[PDB]
Each structure stands twice: as structure tokens, then as C-alpha cells.
Design a binder for this molecule. Structure first.
Ligand SMILES: [Zn+2]
Ligand SMILES: [Zn+2]
Ligand SMILES: [Zn+2]
Length: 178
């Protein structure tokens, strides 16, 4: 197994996957690394199994159809994995914890949102459709762009949204387009 967390790239108290060489901090994995379970297989491994059991699940889909899906166990897992892919980027630190808004010439968003809030909402089964999760994720970056206006810091929202969107298209097998 790797000697650093796959998510945050630090050493520490690491739980090792049994079916692949990745390792995780307890609360870096999503869901949080399960208490017992020998062997244990990471989310990467669980996602690869879904694909291998249903090869056709990689055929292109329309985003509108994906968003309307109910949050059955496989879709729950796919959203957890997509959330984890965002935390895998170090720039996610800006979006992880609860924000606050006091900048001359700007007003805070009407509905603040942040990654750890989306993480709690997934853990608490608060989303009934993929659409709920995707809308809260896109809201994080939209709030950031609107608040920061012409400050160059706006770019951090574009960057982390791009990571989200690329991973969304990969995980949910969105039909490729020009
Ligand atoms: Zn970690
Ligand atoms: Zn694994
Ligand atoms: Zn099949």
C-alpha cells in the first residue's frame, strides 16, 4: 500500500485498501473508513466493481436523465466518489468549511454552501435525487464567482468547478460532445 493518504497526500493514521494499493485517513475517505470489515475495499474499488458488473453503464448518458435519478445505493456511492474527487484537489480547501462574507462592494450569497455541508448531507441521506447533490456542488462555485467579482481570486472557483465537472462527466458516463 501507499504510505500517504490518497486524498490529502499526507502521512498519518492510514487505513489501507485490500484490493488496491491506496491508503486513507479515516475522514478523508468518503464514506468515513468503516470500523471493522476485513477485507475492506476503498470507494475507488467499489466504483470499479459497478462498472465491471455492468459494462454498459459506461455508455453515454444525457445529464438531464442522470440528474433525475433517485439516490439508490449505486447513485449514493457515485456522488460520494465525485465529492471525494473534489477533495483530492488541494484547492478544495477554500471551499471545505463554512464561509463568511465581508468585502467592500459585495454582498454574501443568499444560500451559502460548502463541501463539508454537502458531505454531511450525503452522510445523513438528505438528497433524494442526484440533482440535489449536483445543484449544491455547483452552488458552491457560483456563490464564489458572484461574491469575488473582478478579484482574481474568482479563478479558484473556476478551477475547482472544472475538477468537479470533468469528474461528473467521467463517473456518470455523460455522453461526450463538442
Ligand atoms: Zn488524508
Ligand atoms: Zn481500493
Ligand atoms: Zn449487466
Amino acid at each position: 500500500n501507499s504510505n500517504i493518504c490518497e486524498v490529502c497526500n499526507k502521512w498519518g493514521r492510514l487505513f489501507c485498501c485490500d484490493t488496491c494499493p491506496r491508503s486513507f485517513h479515516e475522514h478523508c475517505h468518503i464514506p468515513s473508513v468503516e470500523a471493522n470489515k476485513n477485507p475492506w475495499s476503498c470507494i475507488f474499488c467499489r466504483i470499479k466493481t459497478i462498472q465491471e458488473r455492468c459494462p454498459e453503464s459506461q455508455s453515454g448518458h444525457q445529464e438531464s436523465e442522470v440528474l433525475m435519478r433517485q439516490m439508490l445505493p449505486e447513485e449514493q456511492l457515485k456522488c460520494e466518489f465525485l465529492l471525494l474527487k473534489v477533495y483530492c484537489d488541494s484547492k478544495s480547501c477554500f471551499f471545505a468549511s463554512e464561509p463568511y462574507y465581508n468585502r467592500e462592494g459585495s454582498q454574501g450569497p443568499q444560500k451559502p454552501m460548502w463541501l463539508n455541508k454537502v458531505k454531511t448531507s450525503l452522510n445523513e441521506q438528505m438528497y433524494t435525487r442526484v440533482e440535489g447533490f449536483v445543484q449544491d456542488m455547483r452552488l458552491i462555485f457560483h456563490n464564489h464567482k458572484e461574491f469575488y467579482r473582478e478579484d482574481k481570486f474568482t479563478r479558484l472557483g473556476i478551477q475547482v468547478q472544472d475538477i468537479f465537472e470533468k469528474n461528473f462527466r467521467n463517473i456518470f458516463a455523460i455522453q461526450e460532445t463538442s
